[PDB]
Amino acid sequence: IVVDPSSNLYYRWLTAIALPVFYNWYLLICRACFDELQSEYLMLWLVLDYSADVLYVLDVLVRARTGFLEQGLMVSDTNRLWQHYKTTTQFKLDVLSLVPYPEVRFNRLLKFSRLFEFFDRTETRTNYPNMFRIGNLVLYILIIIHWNACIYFAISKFIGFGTDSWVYPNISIPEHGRLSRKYIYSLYWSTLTLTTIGETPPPVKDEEYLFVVVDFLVGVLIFATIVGNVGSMISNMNASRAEFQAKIDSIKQYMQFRKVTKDLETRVIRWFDYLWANKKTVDEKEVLKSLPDKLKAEIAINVHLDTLKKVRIFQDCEAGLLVELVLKLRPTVFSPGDYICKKGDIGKEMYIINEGKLAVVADDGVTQFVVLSDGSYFGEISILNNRRTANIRSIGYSDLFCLSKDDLMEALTEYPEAKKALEEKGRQILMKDNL
Amino acid sequence: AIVVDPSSNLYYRWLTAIALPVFYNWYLLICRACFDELQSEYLMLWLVLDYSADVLYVLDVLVRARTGFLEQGLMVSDTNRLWQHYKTTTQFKLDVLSLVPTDLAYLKVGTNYPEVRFNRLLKFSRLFEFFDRTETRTNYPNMFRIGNLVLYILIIIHWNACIYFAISKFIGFGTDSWVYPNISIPEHGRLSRKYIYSLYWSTLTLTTIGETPPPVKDEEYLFVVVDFLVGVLIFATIVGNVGSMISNMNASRAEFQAKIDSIKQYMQFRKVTKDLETRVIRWFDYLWANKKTVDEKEVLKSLPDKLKAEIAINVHLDTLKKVRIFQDCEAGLLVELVLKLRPTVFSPGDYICKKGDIGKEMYIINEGKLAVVADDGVTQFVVLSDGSYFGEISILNIKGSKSGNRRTANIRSIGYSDLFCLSKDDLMEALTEYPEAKKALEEKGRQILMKD
Amino acid sequence: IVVDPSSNLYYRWLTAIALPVFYNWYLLICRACFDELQSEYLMLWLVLDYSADVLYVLDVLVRARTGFLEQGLMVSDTNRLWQHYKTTTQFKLDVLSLVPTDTNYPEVRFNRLLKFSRLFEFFDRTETRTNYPNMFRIGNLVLYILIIIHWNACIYFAISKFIGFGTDSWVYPNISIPEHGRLSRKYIYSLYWSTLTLTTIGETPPPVKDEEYLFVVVDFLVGVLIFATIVGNVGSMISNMNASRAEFQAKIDSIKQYMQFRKVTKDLETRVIRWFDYLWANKKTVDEKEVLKSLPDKLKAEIAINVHLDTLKKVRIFQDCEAGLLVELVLKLRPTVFSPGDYICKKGDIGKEMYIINEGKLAVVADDGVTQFVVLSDGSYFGEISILNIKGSKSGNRRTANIRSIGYSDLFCLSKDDLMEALTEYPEAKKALEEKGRQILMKD
Amino acid sequence: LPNSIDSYTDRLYLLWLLLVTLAYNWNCCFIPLRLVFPYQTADNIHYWLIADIICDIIYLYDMLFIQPRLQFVRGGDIIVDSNELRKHYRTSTKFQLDVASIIPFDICYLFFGFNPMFRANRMLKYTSFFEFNHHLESIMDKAYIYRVIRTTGYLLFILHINACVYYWASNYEGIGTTRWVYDGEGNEYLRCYYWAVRTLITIGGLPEPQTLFEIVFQLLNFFSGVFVFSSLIGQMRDVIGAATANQNYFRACMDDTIAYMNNYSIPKLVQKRVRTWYEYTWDSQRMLDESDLLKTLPTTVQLALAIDVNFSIISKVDLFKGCDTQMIYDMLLRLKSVLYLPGDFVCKKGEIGKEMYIIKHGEVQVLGTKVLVTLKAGSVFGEISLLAAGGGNRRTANVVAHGFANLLTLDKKTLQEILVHYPDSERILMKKARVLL
Numbered sequence A: 001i002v003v004d005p006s007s008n009l010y011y012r013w014l015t016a017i018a019l020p021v022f023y024n025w026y027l028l029i030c031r032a033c034f035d036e037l038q039s040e041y042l043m044l045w046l047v048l049d050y051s052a053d054v055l056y057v058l059d060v061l062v063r064a065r066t067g068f069l070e071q072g073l074m075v076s077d078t079n080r081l082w083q084h085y086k087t088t089t090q091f092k093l094d095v096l097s098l099v100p101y102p103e104v105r106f107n108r109l110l111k112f113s114r115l116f117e118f119f120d121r122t123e124t125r126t127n128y129p130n131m132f133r134i135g136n137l138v139l140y141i142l143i144i145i146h147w148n149a150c151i152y153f154a155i156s157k158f159i160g161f162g163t164d165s166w167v168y169p170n171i172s173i174p175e176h177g178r179l180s181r182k183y184i185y186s187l188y189w190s191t192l193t194l195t196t197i198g199e200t201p202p203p204v205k206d207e208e209y210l211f212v213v214v215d216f217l218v219g220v221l222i223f224a225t226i227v228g229n230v231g232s233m234i235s236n237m238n239a240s241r242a243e244f245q246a247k248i249d250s251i252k253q254y255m256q257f258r259k260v261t262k263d264l265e266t267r268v269i270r271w272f273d274y275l276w277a278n279k280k281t282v283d284e285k286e287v288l289k290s291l292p293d294k295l296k297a298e299i300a301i302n303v304h305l306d307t308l309k310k311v312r313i314f315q316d317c318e319a320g321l322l323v324e325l326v327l328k329l330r331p332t333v334f335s336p337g338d339y340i341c342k343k344g345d346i347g348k349e350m351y352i353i354n355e356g357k358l359a360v361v362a363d364d365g366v367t368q369f370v371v372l373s374d375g376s377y378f379g380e381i382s383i384l385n386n387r388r389t390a391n392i393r394s395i396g397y398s399d400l401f402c403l404s405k406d407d408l409m410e411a412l413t414e415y416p417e418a419k420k421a422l423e424e425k426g427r428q429i430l431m432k433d434n435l
Numbered sequence B: 001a002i003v004v005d006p007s008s009n010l011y012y013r014w015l016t017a018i019a020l021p022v023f024y025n026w027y028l029l030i031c032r033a034c035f036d037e038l039q040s041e042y043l044m045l046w047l048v049l050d051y052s053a054d055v056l057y058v059l060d061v062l063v064r065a066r067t068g069f070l071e072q073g074l075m076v077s078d079t080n081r082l083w084q085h086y087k088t089t090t091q092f093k094l095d096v097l098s099l100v101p102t103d104l105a106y107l108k109v110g111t112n113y114p115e116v117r118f119n120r121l122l123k124f125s126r127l128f129e130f131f132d133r134t135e136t137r138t139n140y141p142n143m144f145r146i147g148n149l150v151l152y153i154l155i156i157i158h159w160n161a162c163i164y165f166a167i168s169k170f171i172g173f174g175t176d177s178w179v180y181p182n183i184s185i186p187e188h189g190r191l192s193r194k195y196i197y198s199l200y201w202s203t204l205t206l207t208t209i210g211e212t213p214p215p216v217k218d219e220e221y222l223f224v225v226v227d228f229l230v231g232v233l234i235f236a237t238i239v240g241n242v243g244s245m246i247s248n249m250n251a252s253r254a255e256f257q258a259k260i261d262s263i264k265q266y267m268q269f270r271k272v273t274k275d276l277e278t279r280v281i282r283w284f285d286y287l288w289a290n291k292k293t294v295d296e297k298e299v300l301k302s303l304p305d306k307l308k309a310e311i312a313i314n315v316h317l318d319t320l321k322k323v324r325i326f327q328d329c330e331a332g333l334l335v336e337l338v339l340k341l342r343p344t345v346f347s348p349g350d351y352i353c354k355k356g357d358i359g360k361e362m363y364i365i366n367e368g369k370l371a372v373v374a375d376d377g378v379t380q381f382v383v384l385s386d387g388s389y390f391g392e393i394s395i396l397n398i399k400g401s402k403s404g405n406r407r408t409a410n411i412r413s414i415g416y417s418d419l420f421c422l423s424k425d426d427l428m429e430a431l432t433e434y435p436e437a438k439k440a441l442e443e444k445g446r447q448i449l450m451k452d
Numbered sequence C: 001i002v003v004d005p006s007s008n009l010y011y012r013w014l015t016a017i018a019l020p021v022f023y024n025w026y027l028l029i030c031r032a033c034f035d036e037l038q039s040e041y042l043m044l045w046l047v048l049d050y051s052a053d054v055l056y057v058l059d060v061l062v063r064a065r066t067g068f069l070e071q072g073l074m075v076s077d078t079n080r081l082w083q084h085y086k087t088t089t090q091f092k093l094d095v096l097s098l099v100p101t102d103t104n105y106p107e108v109r110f111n112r113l114l115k116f117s118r119l120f121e122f123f124d125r126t127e128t129r130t131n132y133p134n135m136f137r138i139g140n141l142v143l144y145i146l147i148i149i150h151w152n153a154c155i156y157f158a159i160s161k162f163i164g165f166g167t168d169s170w171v172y173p174n175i176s177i178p179e180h181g182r183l184s185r186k187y188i189y190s191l192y193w194s195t196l197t198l199t200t201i202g203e204t205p206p207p208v209k210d211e212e213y214l215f216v217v218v219d220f221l222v223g224v225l226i227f228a229t230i231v232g233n234v235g236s237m238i239s240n241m242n243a244s245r246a247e248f249q250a251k252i253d254s255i256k257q258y259m260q261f262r263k264v265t266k267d268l269e270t271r272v273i274r275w276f277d278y279l280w281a282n283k284k285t286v287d288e289k290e291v292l293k294s295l296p297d298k299l300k301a302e303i304a305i306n307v308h309l310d311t312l313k314k315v316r317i318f319q320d321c322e323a324g325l326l327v328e329l330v331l332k333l334r335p336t337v338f339s340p341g342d343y344i345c346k347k348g349d350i351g352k353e354m355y356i357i358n359e360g361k362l363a364v365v366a367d368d369g370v371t372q373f374v375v376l377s378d379g380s381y382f383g384e385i386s387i388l389n390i391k392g393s394k395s396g397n398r399r400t401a402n403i404r405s406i407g408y409s410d411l412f413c414l415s416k417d418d419l420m421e422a423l424t425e426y427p428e429a430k431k432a433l434e435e436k437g438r439q440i441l442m443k444d
Numbered sequence D: 001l002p003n004s005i006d007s008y009t010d011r012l013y014l015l016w017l018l019l020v021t022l023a024y025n026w027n028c029c030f031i032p033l034r035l036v037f038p039y040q041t042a043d044n045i046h047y048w049l050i051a052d053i054i055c056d057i058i059y060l061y062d063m064l065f066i067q068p069r070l071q072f073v074r075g076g077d078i079i080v081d082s083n084e085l086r087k088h089y090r091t092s093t094k095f096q097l098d099v100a101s102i103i104p105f106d107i108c109y110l111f112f113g114f115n116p117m118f119r120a121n122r123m124l125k126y127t128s129f130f131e132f133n134h135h136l137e138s139i140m141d142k143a144y145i146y147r148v149i150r151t152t153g154y155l156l157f158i159l160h161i162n163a164c165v166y167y168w169a170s171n172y173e174g175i176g177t178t179r180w181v182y183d184g185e186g187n188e189y190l191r192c193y194y195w196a197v198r199t200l201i202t203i204g205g206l207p208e209p210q211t212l213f214e215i216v217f218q219l220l221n222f223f224s225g226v227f228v229f230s231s232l233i234g235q236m237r238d239v240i241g242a243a244t245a246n247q248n249y250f251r252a253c254m255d256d257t258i259a260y261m262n263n264y265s266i267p268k269l270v271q272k273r274v275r276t277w278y279e280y281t282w283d284s285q286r287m288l289d290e291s292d293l294l295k296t297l298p299t300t301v302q303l304a305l306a307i308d309v310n311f312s313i314i315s316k317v318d319l320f321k322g323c324d325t326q327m328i329y330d331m332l333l334r335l336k337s338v339l340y341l342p343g344d345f346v347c348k349k350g351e352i353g354k355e356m357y358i359i360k361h362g363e364v365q366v367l368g369t370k371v372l373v374t375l376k377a378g379s380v381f382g383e384i385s386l387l388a389a390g391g392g393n394r395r396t397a398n399v400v401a402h403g404f405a406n407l408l409t410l411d412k413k414t415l416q417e418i419l420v421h422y423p424d425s426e427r428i429l430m431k432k433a434r435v436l437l
C-alpha cells in the first residue's frame, strides 16, 4: 500500500492525525500548568495519551508509506519512499516527537506540520473557505487565550497563591480552590489582558509588572493580527460585489457626465438589475483568460457538445473541425426587445441559440413568422457570400453564441466540403424564402 | 390572475413592506421575551403589532406563491407552475415554519411568554433580500453600507442586552455585583432604566471597552469571556468594514492622485521643462474637474455590445448630426462611426497635426475650439468650432493634385478641445465595401484641393 | 581607498554604526531621565560612550570616502568625494553629532542622537539584503514601538521628578521608600505606565493637577495616532504576507463557484480541483513571464539559461549550433503543465505550437487503442513537422500522430511564427530541422 | 488684486484661501466653545466681537471681491470676461452656501441677547475649507504629511466638539451634582477635553454614569467613539498605503523575483546581478518600468514627454542631421529603454545585429580586450544593423558597458519598417552607412 497525497484516504488520515495534535497542544499545557486536572483525571489522560502515541506512530508509518512524484509519476518503490522520508526534517520532527509530569511529554507538540497540512487541505477542499477561515482564526486565538491563561496560572503558582493582589488567590479557600474556578478565572484574566481591556487587578512585584507589559504588547499585536485578518477576509469576501459595484457606479457616473437620456439610463439600470437578480456577474471573456489552454478547451467542448446535441441541421461536418468551431464560439446575452440584426444591415456575425427565444418580425411590426428556440440556429447566409434578410428581435433575455467573421474565414480557406454542405442548406432556405 | 415581477418596483415596495415586520419581529420579540415588563405593560400594542406582522407574513406567503421566474428568458405567468416551483423549494418550508400557529400555546400560557412566537424570525431572507436590493438600487451605496452595518451591530448589541438581562434574571437580581441590581429599588426598577443599562452593559462588553462590574460566579466568568470574544470579532468586523468603505469611498480619487504622483515623479526625475510639467498637471486637473478621466471603452466594457451601441448613439449622434458631410450618408454607417470614435482631450497650444506630416487619424470636434495656423506661431485663418471636422484628406489617399497626401495645415487648439479621434484603418475598414464615405470624402478632398 | 556603497564592507560598517546609534538613542534618554542609572554605572557609560564616539569619528571618516555614481560608474577621486560630502546636510549632521560639549550630564550629549540616518540606512539595506523581508519589517515595527514606549517611560519619570515624587496619586511614588527606591522597579513601573498609556488601555492612576491632565491628554493622543498607524501597518503586512496565497485561493474559489454553477460533472470538477492541488503542492503556480516582465531581456535570458539550458542541451539537433539563437529560443519559450491522460496533439489539429518535454514522460498513442508505442522522456521534442508543413511530405497541415501525457508533465510551448522568426536570421538550423522533419515524415 | 485670478498658479489666491480657512476654523472651533463654556464674559466680549467682525469681513470680502474673479473653463476655452465670471459665480452652488452663511442673524443680538448660536450659520461655508484642502494637497510635493496633519486636526476637532457637549451635559445636569458630571475644580476645558479623549477613544476609567441621561450620553459617546477610532485606523492605513505605494509595489516585485530565484535554485552571481539591477533601477528611476506609466497617457503627451527627454540626445548625434521630423517622432515613440550592468555585453562579435543603441546617461566601451573608443552618453553604436536584412552583416566589435549604461534600443524590424516609408531618410542613412563602409 502506497498512499496518494492528493487522494481522500490521505485527507481522512490528515483529519485523524489533526485530532491528537489539537488534543496535545490544549490539554498538555493545561495539565502541566494546572496539576489538579492532571491529578484528578489520571485514567482519562492515560487513555488519551496512549491513543495519541498510537496515532503518532501510525503517522510515522503513513509518512513512511506515502509517495512523492518524480518526472510527473508517483514512486511506489518503498525503499525509495523510505529514503526520501529519511532525508527530510519532518522525519526528524517525528522521531523527536516520539521520544519515550507532562513537562517530559512536551515533545509531542512538534508534529504541528500535520495540523497545518490539515488546515491547508481543508482550505483547498471545502466549499465554505470563508467559514473555515473564521473557524481557523477563532481556533488560533482560543489557543493563545488558553496558553496565556496557563502561563498566568504558572506564574501565579511560582510566586505564591494569594500573596499579592495580582496573582491568583489563595487556593486553600474553597471558593478559589475549585478546578473550574481556577480555569475560568485564569481564562478571564487571559481574555482581559490579550484583548487589551485591562480590568485585572494591578501588578505589585517587578516580575508581575514585566509579565503584564510583555503580555499587553503581545495582546496588542494579537489584536492587530485579528483586525488585519478579519479586514482582509471581509474585503476578499465582498471583492467581487465591490468590483461590480465599482463598474456599475463608473457606468452611472459616465452616463450622468455625458447627460444620456432617461430611457437609456433606466434600460442600463434594468440590465444591471437582471444581472444581479440572475447571478450573471462574472463574464466568460475575463474568466477564461487565466486558464491553461487544455482546461479552457475541455469545459468549452463539454458545454458546446451539450448544446450542439440539440441542433440537428449542422451535423454534416468533420468531427474535430466542428469541435474547434464550437470551441471558438463565444457567448453574449441580449435584452428583450433588442434587434439582433435589422433589415438594412450587413452581417459579420453568426449565432447559435441556447436558452433563449428569438422571433423574426417584419418592418416595425410585431408578428411571429417563425420563432427560434433552444436548438435552433441562424445568421449564416450573409457571411460566406451580403445583408441580413430578416428582422430578428429578442422576445426575452436570450443567450446567443456569437461568431466572428474570421472563424468562418478560417473554416472557408482550409476546409470546403462542410461549408459547402452548410451553404447548400443556406441556398435551400434561400430558394424557400425567395427563389 | 395577476403575477408580480421580481425586477419591477411593486416587488421592491413589497420587499420594503415585508422587511418592516421582520425587523420588528427580531428586535421586539427578543426584548419582549427577556424583559417581561415591556410585554406586560404594552399588551394591546403587542397584540396589534402581532396581528399586523402575521397578516403581512400571510400576504408574503401569498406573494411568494405568485412571483414569476425566468425560464427561456420569459417570465412564467402560470399560477400552478409558480405554486409548484415555490412548493419544491426550502423558502416555502421556512415560511410555513414561520407561520406555525403557536398562538394557541401563547394563549394557553396566558399571553405573557412570547418565547413561543420565536419562529417568526425565520423570514430573515426577506430582510437580506431587501438589503441586497437597496444596496444595488440606491444612489448612496457607501452611506447605505454604513446604515446596514450600524443596523447589524445594533441588532447584535440589543440581542446581547436582552441576553444579559435574562441571565441576570436567571441568576437573581442584586445578589452579586455583576448582575443587574435589585429591581425592587425604585431607581433600578424602571423599565427604561433596565433597558438602557442593559444596552450600556452590552455596548461596553461587545465593543471591548470593559468598564462594567467584574463577575463573581463561574457562569458569569464564562458568559463574560464568551461575550468578550464575540465582541473582539465584532470590533474587528467594524474596523475592517469601515476601513474597507473608506478605501471604497475615495478609490477613484486615490488612483487619480496615484497617477498624478507617478507622472509627476517621472517628470521630476527626468527634469522636463516647467511649462510642460504644468501643462500635464493642468491637463490632469481639467480631466478631473470635467468628470472625464476613465476611458469610454473601459467604462462600457461590462455592458453588452448592443447596449454599447445604443449608449454611443445617444451620446455622439447629437454631435455627429451637426456635421456637413455625413448628411448624405446612411444611418448604419452613422451607428458604426459612433461605435468607432474614441474621444480624446487636447490642451491649449497643443498641435493636432503639423504641416508636412503624413496622416493616420481624422478628428471630429465636440465641445472644443480650434484654429488652423501658419508656421509663424498662431495665425488664425479659420477658427473651427463644435460639430465640424478636420484631418480628413490625408487618410483617403485620393490622387490628382500637387499636394499628394501629407498634412498641409498647422492646427492648434485654442482651448481644452475634446476631439473624436477616428483612425484611417478603422474608418476605411468600416466603409470598405460601402462607397458613401468614398464619394463624399472625395468631394471634400476635391474642395480642399480646390482651396489648394 | 574608496568604499563602495553597494558592497558587503559598507553593510558591515552600517551594522557597526547602527549599533552605537541605537545605543545612543535608548540609553541616552534613559541615563538623562533616571539619574540612578547614570550615577551608578559610570564606568560602563564611560566605556560605551568612548566606543560610540570612536565609531562616530570613524563614521565621518568613512562617509568622507564613500563613492557615488556619476555617468553610471563609481568615482574614485578622493577630493571629489570629500567635496560632494562637504556640500551636503549629512556633513552638518555628522559634525553636529561629534562636538564634545562634555561625567555628570548625559544631557549635554543629546547631539549624538542626530545620526538617525545611519540607523535608517542600515534598516533599509537589511530590508533589501535579507531573505525574510516581512519578518524584518515586523521586527522594525516592534523596535519602533519599543523605542516609543521606552521614551515615554523616561518622559513620564522626568515629569514625575519635575512635579515631585509622591505629592500626587498620578506621579511616581515616594523615592525614599525602599520598595520604590530601586532603579529596576523605577524603570519597570515607568515602562508599565508608558505601555498602558500609549496602548490606550488606561488603567493607571488618573491625573490630579492640570499639567498632569494636559500630559495625559497629549500622551493618549500620541498613543492613539501611533497605534492606529501600527495597526494599519500590521494589516498591510498581513495582506502582503498572504497576497500570493490570496490570489491563488481567489482563482481557486472563482473556478469552484464556476464549477458549481456550470453544471459540470464530478469527473471534470475533481480534475480541476486535483490540478490546482497539484499546482499548490509543486509550487509552480506563478507565471515566469508575469513575474519577470519588467526585467531586461539580458537578465531574463541569464535566468532562462541558468534554469532550462542545462536541461535543453541534451539534444542531438541543436546542441552547438548557435548560443545566441539558443538564448533567444529560451527567451521565447513558454511552459505549460498538462494533466495525466490528456492529449497534447490529435489527428487533425492545426499545428501552431512546438513542445519540448521537461520533467515529464509522454507516450505516442495510436488512433483507436491505448497502445504505448515509444515513451518520450524529458529532453525530447515533438510538434515540429506540422508547424513546418514542408514540401515532399504528406503536407496536410494536420498533426500526424497523437501525443498523450502519462504523468504531470511540464512541456515548453513554442509557437510556429515564434520559431520561424527565431530561425529566420540564421536559417542553417531551420534547414537542418527541415531535413529531420523530412526523414521522419518520409519513413513514418 | 487683478481683474481675473487664475486659481492654479496664484499663491496669493492660496493665501486668500488660507485666510478664509482660518476664519472658518475660528468659527467652527469657537462657536461651540463660546456657546457652552463661560468664556464669553463681559470683559472679553469686545475681543470676541473684534475677531467675529474680522471673520465676517473676510467672509464678505470672499463673497464680493475674490470669488467673482475666478477664471473658469467653459466650452473648452477659458473665460476672462468679468461679467461672465460674475454670472458663473452667481449661478453656482457655492453662492447659495455663501449667502446662506452671511445672513445677519446678528440682528437677533438685540432681540434675544448675546448668543453665539446665532453665528452658527457661519459653519455652512465648508466649501472654502475643502477648496483650500484640495489646493494645498495639489500644490504640495509630499501630500501625505498634509493628509496626516488634516486627519489629526479632524480627530482633535471631534474631541473638541465632544468636550463642548460634555460641558453642556454637565451644566444641564448640574455642575457637581452626580459623580459622572464635571466637578468644577480645575481648567474646565482641559478636564472636559480629558473626558472627551478617554470616552471617544474608548479608554474608560472615568466615573460610571449614575442616572439615565448620563447612561444614554455615555452609551452614544462610546458608540460614536468606536466608529471614530475605526475611521482613524482606516484613514491612517489609507495614508500609509498611498504614501509608500510605489516603494511597496517595487519591494513586492523585487521580493517576488528573489522568491522565484530561490525557488528555482539560481546561482549566487545571477541572483546578485538581478538584485544589483533592482537596486540601481530604484536608485535611478524610482519606478519599476516607465513604459507601464507612459502607455497610460495619450499619444500627444507621450510625444511631448518623449521629444523633451530624448531630442537633445538624438540631435547631438551628428549622423542624425539629415533625417525628418515625423520619422524621428515615430522613432522616439518606438525607443525602448533598457539598462546594462557593468561588464555586460550589448553587442557580441559575430552575432546577429537587430538593435540600434542610443546611449543615454551611461558609458560603454568597444573592444579582443583593447579599447578603441569609449562612447559617452548621447552617442550611438549599431549602424551595421541599419542596412542588413535577414542575416546580412554581423557585429564587427565587442561592445561592453563600462558603467551602469542606460541604452535606448531601436529594433531593426521597426527601424526598417519606418525607413521603407521614408526613402529620403533611408537615402541619407544609407549614404552615411556607405561612407562608414
Ligand SMILES: Nc1nc2c(ncn2[C@@H]2O[C@@H]3COP(=O)(O)O[C@H]3[C@H]2O)c(=O)[nH]1
Binding pocket: A341, A347, A370, A377, A378, A379, A380, A381, A382, A387, A388, A389, A390, A391, A392, A433
Ligand atoms: N431569411 C431568413 N433568415 C432566417 C430564417 N430562419 C432563420 N434565419 C436567419 O435569419 C437571418 C437574419 O439575418 P441574415 O440575413 O443575416 O440571415 C438570416 C438567417 O440566417 C428564415 O426563415 N428566413
Ligand SMILES: Nc1nc2c(ncn2[C@@H]2O[C@@H]3COP(=O)(O)O[C@H]3[C@H]2O)c(=O)[nH]1
Binding pocket: B353, B359, B372, B382, B389, B390, B391, B392, B393, B394, B406, B407, B408, B409, B410, B411, B448, B451
Ligand atoms: N489645408 C486645410 N485643411 C483644412 C482646412 N479647413 C479644414 N481643414 C483640415 O485641416 C487639416 C489639417 O490636417 P490635414 O492635413 O490632415 O488635413 C487638413 C483638412 O482636413 C483648410 O482651409 N485647409
Ligand SMILES: Nc1nc2c(ncn2[C@@H]2O[C@@H]3COP(=O)(O)O[C@H]3[C@H]2O)c(=O)[nH]1
Binding pocket: C345, C351, C364, C381, C382, C383, C384, C385, C386, C387, C398, C399, C400, C401, C402, C403, C444
Ligand atoms: N507522426 C509522428 N509524429 C511523431 C513520432 N514521434 C514523435 N512524433 C511527433 O509527434 C507529432 C504529433 O504532432 P505533429 O504532427 O505536430 O508532429 C509529430 C512529431 O513531431 C512518430 O513516430 N510519428
Ligand SMILES: Nc1nc2c(ncn2[C@@H]2O[C@@H]3COP(=O)(O)O[C@H]3[C@H]2O)c(=O)[nH]1
Binding pocket: D347, D353, D366, D372, D373, D380, D381, D382, D383, D384, D385, D394, D395, D396, D397, D399
Ligand atoms: N568596429 C567598430 N564599431 C564602432 C567603432 N566606433 C563606433 N562603432 C560602432 O560600434 C559597433 C558595435 O556594433 P556593430 O558591429 O553593430 O557596429 C559597430 C559600429 O557602428 C569603432 O571604432 N569600431
Ligand SMILES: *[C@@H]1O[C@H](CO)[C@@H](O)[C@H](O)[C@H]1NC(C)=O
Binding pocket: A160, A161, A162, A163, A170, A171, A172, A173
Ligand atoms: C490560605 O488560607 C489558609 C487557611 O485559610 C492559611 O492557613 C494560609 O496561610 C493562606 N495562605 C496565604 C498565602 O495567605
Ligand SMILES: *[C@@H]1O[C@H](CO)[C@@H](O)[C@H](O)[C@H]1NC(C)=O
Binding pocket: B173, B174, B175, B182, B183, B184, B185
Ligand atoms: C430587594 O429589595 C427588597 C425590598 O427592599 C428586599 O426585600 C429584597 O430582599 C431585595 N433583594 C435582594 C436580592 O437583596
Ligand SMILES: *[C@@H]1O[C@H](CO)[C@@H](O)[C@H](O)[C@H]1NC(C)=O
Binding pocket: C165, C166, C167, C174, C175, C176, C177
Ligand atoms: C517620602 O518619605 C520620607 C520618609 O519616608 C518623608 O520624610 C517624605 O515626606 C516623603 N515624601 C512625600 C512627598 O510624601
